Design a protein around this ligand. Structure first.
Ligand SMILES: *[C@@H]1O[C@H](CO)[C@@H](O[C@@H]2O[C@H](CO)[C@@H](O)[C@H](O)[C@H]2NC(C)=O)[C@H](O)[C@H]1NC(C)=O
Ligand SMILES: *[C@@H]1O[C@H](CO)[C@@H](O[C@@H]2O[C@H](CO)[C@@H](O)[C@H](O)[C@H]2NC(C)=O)[C@H](O)[C@H]1NC(C)=O
Ligand SMILES: *[C@@H]1O[C@H](CO)[C@@H](O[C@@H]2O[C@H](CO)[C@@H](O)[C@H](O)[C@H]2NC(C)=O)[C@H](O)[C@H]1NC(C)=O
Ligand SMILES: *[C@@H]1O[C@H](CO)[C@@H](O[C@@H]2O[C@H](CO)[C@@H](O)[C@H](O)[C@H]2NC(C)=O)[C@H](O)[C@H]1NC(C)=O
Ligand code: NAG
Ligand code: NAG
Lengths: 117, 109, 163, 52, 119, 163, 163, 119, 119
């Protein structure tokens, strides 16, 4: 008999949200604001490769440890990477005075030139 | 399909009209919009909703629709009106999709 | 909801209405069919995208932040550094979770309000030439063809012509 | 490895435009904000009541 | 708003191509977006469009099995992929605003253009 | 309130209704009496306990935190420590007070909405066989015994039988 | 708005009503004129001033706070000091902006609710001796002089006397 | 929902006892909680119950002057105290859920039991 | 609430004066505020008042072109300025509360007073 009705939309989605008065409300449309996925590898930052020390630490890299013979040509990087097995530092026992301040200073250096003083 | 007169020729200061004719499938049950493309640029909207104008469009441009055909009228013609004019309508029966015209070369003397 | 329309006196949604959020379903001698209401859906979409963009804008991008090192005789400064890091992390976690939890409820009430407003808009138009059935539904007294339906779904229904 | 990125953590690179992450508090580059949450979903549609 | 396409591309037949479109303002938009093709010497051609929140996509019956249109939302970018390039998919490609959230016939803002050559 | 029912067109509460938050009071030849509405009260209780549990959960337990010591030549670090402590205390005090203040108003609007929904539910059922008096009250035209009363409070009132 | 009265079924404001926020406009044989409603305006003013005073009170005055100095071998403590300052500034900026943004919307819904309540209060009074026109307007069936108007704008309109 | 009572107790006549019940989940609940007694070799016996928000307590006419039931809300526990122990208050005591906020006849979740001996 | 005026002032003819009024409580108020004048040996005189949110000001027809009343809101202070002093602008000046937001006839709270001499 010539009828007219008002209504709203429904679909087959199964995505739920939380409010204060209720949990797990299924809704028609929603967006996700959190990221929890990575690729699992150390990559290059905007073109430049990082500097991986490997067996050495900052003290061994800078002092010239006999086991860090491969880091000599390095002159540029985007960040420095250390590992928990970086144990080749000072071979002769003694004290390195103001070492953490040196690390803090090097945390803002992107390149250097090594010359014979 | 929308068919327009391929060319138009008139003198400065005159009034000209281009007719977009179609069929009951597209033109008879929808609106028509008009676009003007200068040589080397993207199209620009002139008339929408069959007689309406956006912001920044002069009063010299107007248009209307008559049954199964629309018409765009330009009065106050000058040299800066050298372009191609296209008519468009949202066809909808088997599978709805936008349909463009053929083209019109409004030549000024 | 606070307005009683969604899951209220209109107890279910339509899976046959695919182009909008709110709309009409009509029935006469020509046939039946659904049809979305474009103005209400457009206004709701504007509001929702505004809200999402504001939420995105209020949180700024985080730049480089790496840890420090201390020796065996600098425990107090190391503990202070840990305290600062943990406190800021806790504060921002609380802020984010509370913002999402509080915005979801308002978003759910918005649609209920819109549906109720549409129902009232139609009801004041028909007033006397239609019977309210109860499920968001109106049954005409006279014969309402497609011109009548399209005028009802436009706001320009002519009351005096149909008595 | 030999790849490219804009945001690096001690556990991998991040490839998103979302405003939040829960991977690592230490980051290098242009990175989203770190939170300890496990779920942050924002609603844009209405309540889903099909079959009626 | 301002619409900016990607750079110009030249390929050889049998391959595919992917063009992009970036819009200014907030990442989320309340208007539909369309892609238009125009070969040198002829009128424009509507290829397909996408809807902001519902995510629906529409294509022309000619470009049914080749074109694929996607969006990013949080980035503000729209992508179009065309597969099985012939020697006739050599034209100018435009990105077009729509006004409302539906893919109607009124496109009020256009981009600038991007040439894709096939040889 | 925003909905105009509590302290509005229903201007007072009932001290004789002890088992619920919202309900009915009836009167016929058999007698009078109050009776709570179980579904509305149950839904409101669920919502309120959910809100309280969420508020409790968003605040985590505080673990051991004692002070440090400095000498006469370490004033800058001592001042930084005081700054950090005071700032965190201020931030958390602000958070707690604002949360309570903002939740109380929504809690008060929730009950007003529920009362209005119950009133409208009854009004659409009676429609024509009852007169609206004004204080949330309906006066029947026909004779309504206990079966009719129980059918009204169950949602299955039969309109056609009583004309 | 959420209640559909302001920019809804009443689509415009009055520049001729200068002494209040909500009111009436009447028309009979004596003449025309606007008149504000004092109780609604007084309640709204009380609420709004309470809200502004609470917002002012929740933010405390800032006392003396100047910077420190470090030498070339104290970079870590200098960086920690910068971190603390920047973090607290960011947190308080976020708090202030969010508070203002969220309070504005509630303030705008408050007035819509008040206008709707006034309209319903008048509508339940007139019920049958007046016709609803649609723009917030009522047209009487009998003759309403200034005593009848002043009784309508008081809540004591006598229904039975005018049938 | 899991309900866990306290340990088993043995007392001698003339004293009082206090048993407890802990429920899993959020501290605040939307259902009523009852205490049930069962002597060895007979059917169960309803003692009394408590209501979540209104705080009303109900007792059986037999156990009207001895039993006292209380709640903690923020801890999530319910306590029952029985005074003036006789030699017949030696049974198994159960903690029972109720479904709704009222103390009806339908208890859908039970605990495990707790023996109180009197000697 | 408590209303406190400024100190007592003595000037000489031809100049202007500015008196002040501070109210206790929150900075923003929901009542109107009036200024009243009383010469020695005569009844009081209403000068003018101000409205809380709409900002409207009202003056007596006698003091039309001389008085100016302003408010500070965030400070909680009201200022009155009287220009072109004569030998008759020597009286006691009171600050008066009003009850509601309108400047009616009912002032329910008064200050303490402030003498302005002109010589
Ligand atoms: C909302 O849904 C989630 C996922 O379905 C529920 O998470 C489960 O919660 C129960 C106890 O509450 C656990 O035993 C399950 O292991 C959880 N499942 C997963 C996959 O984590 C959650 O409980 C639901 N919320 C409510 C209030 O019922
Ligand atoms: C649907 O409603 C609109 C809104 O009133 C109508 O728009 C009017 O259309 C007439 C011509 O039919 C114009 O003269 C008016 O200027 C339009 N009004 C406005 C505000 O633009 C429209 O006509 C209605 N549709 C139908 C089929 O009647
Ligand atoms: C009160 O309302 C409920 C809900 O409609 C009624 O429940 C129905 O009861 C009949 C038998 O009387 C069953 O056949 C139906 O299956 C029930 N429906 C549902 C949804 O459960 C109930 O009967 C009503 N009470 C009275 C006294 O009429
Ligand atoms: C306007 O309404 C008020 C509120 O009812 C009326 O106030 C009553 O006035 C009568 C005398 O006219 C008193 O006996 C009552 O005690 C008053 N009631 C209250 C609650 O104070 C007022 O009279 C009405 N105005 C007119 C002109 O009728
Ligand atoms: C809903 O139906 C569509 C129809 O193809 C399907 O693609 C989609 O996966 C369905 N959604 C879910 C959640 O299954
Ligand atoms: C990841 O990043 C790379 C380059 O950084 C990009 O090409 C790619 O589209 C991103 N997404 C995925 C899913 O690989």
């Amino acid at each position: 008999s010539d009828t007219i009705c008002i209504g709203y939309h429904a679909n087959n989605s199964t995505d739920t949200v939380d409010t204060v008065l209720e949990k797990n409300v299924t809704v028609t449309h929603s967006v996700n604001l959190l990221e929890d996925s990575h690729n699992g590898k150390l990559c290059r930052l905007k073109g430049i490769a990082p500097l991986q020390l490997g067996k050495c630490n900052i003290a061994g890299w800078i002092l010239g440890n006999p086991e860090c013979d491969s880091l000599l040509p390095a002159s540029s990087w985007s960040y420095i990477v250390e590992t928990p097995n970086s144990k080749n530092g000072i071979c002769y026992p003694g004290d390195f005075i103001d070492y953490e301040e040196l690390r803090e200073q090097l945390s803002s250096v992107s390149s250097f030139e090594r010359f014979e003083i | 399909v929308l068919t327009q007169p391929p060319s138009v020729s008139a003198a400065p200061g005159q009034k000209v009209t281009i007719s977009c004719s179609g069929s009951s499938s597209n033109i008879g049950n929808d609106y028509v919009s008009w676009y003007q493309q200068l040589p080397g640029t993207a199209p620009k909207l002139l008339i929408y909703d069959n007689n309406k104008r956006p912001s920044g469009i002069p009063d010299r441009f107007s248009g209307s629709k008559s049954g199964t055909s629309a018409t765009l009228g330009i009065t106050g013609l000058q040299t800066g009106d050298e372009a191609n004019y296209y008519c468009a309508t949202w066809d909808r029966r088997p599978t709805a999709y936008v349909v463009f015209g053929g083209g019109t070369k409004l030549t000024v003397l | 909801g606070l307005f009683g329309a969604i899951a209220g006196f209109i107890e279910g949604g339509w899976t046959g209405m695919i182009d909008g959020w709110y709309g009409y379903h009509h029935q006469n001698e020509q046939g039946s069919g659904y049809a979305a209401d474009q103005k209400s859906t457009q206004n709701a979409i504007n509001g929702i995208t505004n809200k999402v963009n504001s939420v995105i804008e209020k949180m700024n991008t985080q730049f480089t932040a790496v840890g420090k090192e201390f020796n065996n005789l600098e425990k107090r400064m190391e503990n202070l550094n840990k305290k600062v890091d943990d406190g800021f992390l806790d504060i921002w976690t609380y802020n984010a979770e509370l913002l999402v939890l509080l915005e979801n409820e308002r978003t759910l009430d918005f649609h209920d309000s819109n549906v109720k407003n549409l129902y009232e808009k139609v009801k004041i138009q028909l007033k006397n030439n239609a019977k309210e059935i109860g499920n968001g539904c109106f049954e005409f007294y006279h014969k309402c063809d497609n011109e009548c339906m399209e005028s009802v779904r436009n706001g320009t229904y002519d009351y005096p012509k149909y008595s | 490895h030999e790849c490219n990125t804009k945001c690096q953590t001690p556990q991998g690179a991040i490839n998103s435009s979302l405003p939040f992450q829960n991977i690592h508090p230490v980051t290098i580059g242009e990175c989203p904000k770190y939170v300890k949450s496990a779920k942050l979903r924002m609603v844009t549609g209405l309540r889903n009541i099909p079959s009626i | 708003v301002q619409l900016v396409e990607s750079g110009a591309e030249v390929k050889k037949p049998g391959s595919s191509v992917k063009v992009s479109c970036k819009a200014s303002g907030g990442p989320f938009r309340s208007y539909a977006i369309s892609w238009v093709r125009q070969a040198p010497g002829q009128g424009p051609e509507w290829m397909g469009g996408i809807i902001p929140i519902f995510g629906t996509t529409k294509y022309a019956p000619k470009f049914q099995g080749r074109v694929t249109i996607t969006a990013d939302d949080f980035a503000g970018t729209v992508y179009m992929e065309l597969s099985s390039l012939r020697s006739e998919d050599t034209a100018m490609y435009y990105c077009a605003k729509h006004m409302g959230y539906q893919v109607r016939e009124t496109m009020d803002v256009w981009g600038k253009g991007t040439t894709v050559t096939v040889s």
